[PDB]
């Protein structure tokens, strides 16, 4: 339970080999969070990978839609 990160020595947190969204940022890519219960430190994850099926004669056209309502708060 002693991890060496590019930002310092993190003692008390269990290093893992997964990658989730950031909960508590530490630095240089590492983020820590309370999960299976102990504190873990994992490399940050930028989002689920995807690969658009590009082809020179293929197009995708929506057949349906949603109406969404979002909230934006400004001082």
């Amino acid at each position: 339970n002693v991890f060496q990160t590019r930002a310092g020595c993190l003692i008390g947190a269990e290093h893992v080999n997964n990658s989730y969204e950031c909960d508590i940022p530490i630095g240089a890519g590492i983020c820590a969070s309370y999960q299976t219960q102990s504190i873990i430190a994992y490399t940050m994850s930028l989002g689920a990978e995807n690969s658009v099926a590009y082809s020179n004669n293929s197009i995708a056209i929506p057949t349906n839609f949603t109406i969404s309502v979002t909230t934006e708060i400004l001082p």
Binding site: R6, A7, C22, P25, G27, A28, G29, M44, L46, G47, A48, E49, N50, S51, V52, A53, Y54, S55, N56, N57, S58, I59, A60, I61, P62
Partner: protein, 216 residues
């Protein structure tokens, strides 16, 4: 986009490991905590800036291996996996052109330059393969020539102009990219807007450190 996340500690800076000085310093109240708080606020905001600028795509898209974009040639700007990092050619040219122990610390950024390169690769692949539709909800593929026809139709030039001039337009785009590459490789004055930031921060820290040598 972001400065350097510097931090300082007042007691170490002013009264270096000296008990008498640190007992005198206590009579000035909360000056120390206030300064540390302000610098921490700046430090966090600096990562909020990068998050807001780059993290605008939900998923990390990728370009197909069979790159047949109707004539256009993006190999200058897309990632080059042969290199250790994912940085593209022009990104490398940009990086190669931009250049103590008194309590001063330089915290590291939360998003490492490789992760930023992954974000920009995602944005570039998304725009190339899906037009502007990855901005709103899902990404819907579309042939690049048809995307460009949509773009021309967007500025009052009918579609047939692109298709009838596709090879000419592709060549002009490729040559323009080449000229950008040569301009960045040759001249160094273009990146003044970033060099001024780095210089101003370095000069501020050098003055701060030199102030310790004064009698007062």
């Amino acid at each position: 986009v972001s400065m350097t996340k510097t931090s300082v500690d007042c007691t170490m800076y002013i009264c270096g490991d000296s008990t008498e000085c640190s007992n005198l310093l206590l009579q000035y109240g909360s000056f120390c905590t206030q300064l540390n708080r302000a610098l921490t606020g700046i430090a966090v905001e600096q990562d909020k800036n990068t998050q807001e600028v780059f993290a605008q795509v939900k998923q990390i898209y990728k370009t197909p291996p069979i790159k047949d974009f109707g004539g256009f040639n993006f190999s200058q700007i897309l990632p080059d996996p042969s290199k250790p990092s994912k940085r593209s050619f022009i990104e490398d040219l940009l990086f190669n052109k931009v250049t103590k122990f008194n309590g001063l610390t330089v915290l590291p950024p939360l998003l490492t330059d490789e992760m930023i390169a992954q974000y920009t690769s995602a944005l570039l692949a998304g725009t190339i393969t899906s037009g502007w539709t990855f901005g709103a909800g899902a990404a819907l593929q579309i042939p690049f020539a048809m995307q460009m026809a949509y773009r021309f139709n967007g500025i009052g030039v009918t579609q047939n102009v692109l298709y009838e001039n596709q090879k000419l337009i592709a060549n002009q785009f490729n040559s323009a990219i080449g000229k950008i590459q040569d301009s960045l490789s040759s001249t160094a004055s273009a990146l003044g807007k970033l060099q001024d930031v780095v210089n101003q921060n370095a000069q501020a820290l050098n003055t701060l450190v030199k102030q310790l040598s004064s009698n007062f």
